[PDB]
Design a protein around this ligand. Structure first.
Ligand code: MG
Length: 124
């Protein structure tokens, strides 16, 4: 239930990456790294032996859902737990992400407490 887990944080707005990185810092996970887009995240996952991915859903290059799909179709990557960050869980979006295989979702603006709750849910 490891706090050394290697985490990738994906999102185009560096200030949001930095909030996420902190939040996870309050919770005991310090092993976090960043990518600014699914285009930049895929090569980091592919070569860097990650355990966990927190991805925004809206990115101009390759969208959250395209990253998730790329991860799930890669035998190497296929086991990764993925939390998606959304500005609003319209159900059509959550449904579609669940189909695509996400482990959970969390609505922004979120908190540490909600982050943990979400972390617990996914990992069972
Ligand atoms: Mg975004």
């Amino acid at each position: 239930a490891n706090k050394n887990m290697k985490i990738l944080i994906v999102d185009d707005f560096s200030t949001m990456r930095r909030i996420v990185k902190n939040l996870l810092r309050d919770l005991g996970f310090n092993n976090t790294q960043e990518a600014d887009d699914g285009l930049t995240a895929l090569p980091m996952l592919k070569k860097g032996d990650f355990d966990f991915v927190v991805t925004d859903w809206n990115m101009p290059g390759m969208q959250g859902i395209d990253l998730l799909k790329n991860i799930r179709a890669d035998e190497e990557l296929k086991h990764l737990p993925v939390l998606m960050i959304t500005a609003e869980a319209k159900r059509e979006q959550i449904i579609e992400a669940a189909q695509a295989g996400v482990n959970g979702y969390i609505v922004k603006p979120f908190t540490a407490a909600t982050l943990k709750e979400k972390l617990d849910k996914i990992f069972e």
